[PDB]
RNA sequence: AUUAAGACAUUCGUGAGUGAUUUAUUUCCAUGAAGUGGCGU
């Protein structure tokens, strides 16, 4: 059994239905975490959409993810998922097109969750998250903060919350934090990002059916904005050698795009996967 | 080897159909092409 964590990176907008009970305006909403009310992807949607990518190696699909369902004989998985959580998002800013927005409790919750894991990459990278956090709260000192790194996206606005960023020049960002959490980042207070994160800041995307030239249905859409990233863990149970490498191979191919969600003939939830990177 | 295993809230769906920046409003009112001869005592 290794532990290994896997970034999304999605490639296009992201539908993934929640299903509970819906009352508001957006007819169609995302699946949010219970805890946290964050954006998240269930690990029935990953399995899901890995055994259909791989649906057509069937000897890989039956030792990894098990026997399809209505079949006489049943086998059990191998491979265990644990639910995706939003890692970065993309915000809309002024100097640039856009900044990935990260908030420092959603990093507290990844070193977090890296040291219950055990991740293989896990020491490297909670040793120098650790210290990026203990120096963004010795900057900040208890006050909303809004830190980019790059000295020329100082002074950036994020459009949403009227934030200015700013550049402290004491914190440095190593290089393989920068590829982990994006290009163009920023590290907010977890309530900016709760607030860009939100029913009232993600995009609503209005769709109608047309039947002889007029509109029969109208309904609004809420998706996951292009470009965000979600990290999830995955366990393998000692599952042979050899289908277990070709599937991490495969999974971590640049060809290798999977599609999560819905809307998928109108390119909904197409996404890449990322393993660890060593530090 | 454990009241277990297996299962993407997914498929289909054009924010569209009808819609003159238009109705109305005087570039007008005032005014003399007119004043005056002179020497030749």
């Given at each position: 059994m290794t532990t290994r964590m896997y970034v999304i990176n999605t490639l296009s907008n992201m539908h993934v239905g929640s299903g509970e009970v819906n009352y508001g305006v957006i007819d169609n909403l995302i699946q949010r975490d219970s805890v946290t009310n964050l954006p998240n992807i269930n690990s029935s949607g990953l399995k899901g959409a890995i055994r259909e990518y791989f649906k057509e190696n069937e000897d890989l699909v039956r030792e990894l993810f098990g026997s399809a369902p209505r079949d006489e004989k049943?086998?059990?998985?191998?491979?265990?998922?644990?639910?995706?959580?939003?890692?970065s998002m993309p915000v809309r800013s002024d100097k640039v097109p856009?900044?990935?927005?990260?908030?420092?409790?959603?990093?507290?919750?990844?070193?977090?969750?890296?040291?219950?894991?055990?991740?293989?990459?896990?020491?490297?990278?909670?040793?120098?998250?650790?210290?990026?956090?203990?120096?963004?709260?010795?900057?900040?000192?208890?006050?909303?903060?809004?830190?980019?790194?790059?000295?020329?996206?100082?002074?950036?606005?994020?459009?949403?919350?009227?934030?200015?960023?700013?550049?402290?020049?004491?914190?440095?960002?190593?290089?393989?934090?920068?590829?982990?959490?994006?290009?163009?980042?920023?590290?907010?207070?977890?309530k900016y990002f709760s607030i860009l994160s939100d029913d009232n800041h993600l995009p609503v995307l209005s769709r109608n059916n047309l039947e002889n030239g007029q509109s029969a249905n109208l309904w609004y859409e809420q998706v996951l904005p292009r470009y965000s990233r979600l990290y999830f863990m995955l366990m393998d149970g000692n599952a042979q050698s050899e289908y277990l490498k070709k599937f991490r191979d495969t999974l971590c191919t640049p060809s290798t795009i999977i599609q999560i969600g819905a809307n998928a003939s109108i390119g909904y939830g197409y996404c890449q996967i990322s393993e660890l990177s060593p530090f």
């Open positions: 049943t086998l059990p998985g191998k491979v265990r998922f644990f639910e995706a959580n939003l890692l856009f900044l990935m927005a990260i908030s420092d409790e959603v990093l507290q919750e990844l070193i977090t969750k890296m040291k219950f894991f055990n991740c293989e990459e896990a020491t490297q990278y909670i040793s120098h998250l650790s210290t990026l956090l203990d120096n963004i709260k010795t900057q900040a000192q208890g006050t909303d903060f809004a830190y980019v790194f790059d000295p020329l996206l100082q002074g950036a606005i994020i459009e949403e919350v009227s934030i200015r960023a700013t550049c402290p020049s004491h914190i440095p960002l190593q290089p393989s934090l920068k590829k982990l959490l994006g290009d163009r980042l920023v590290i907010l207070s977890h």
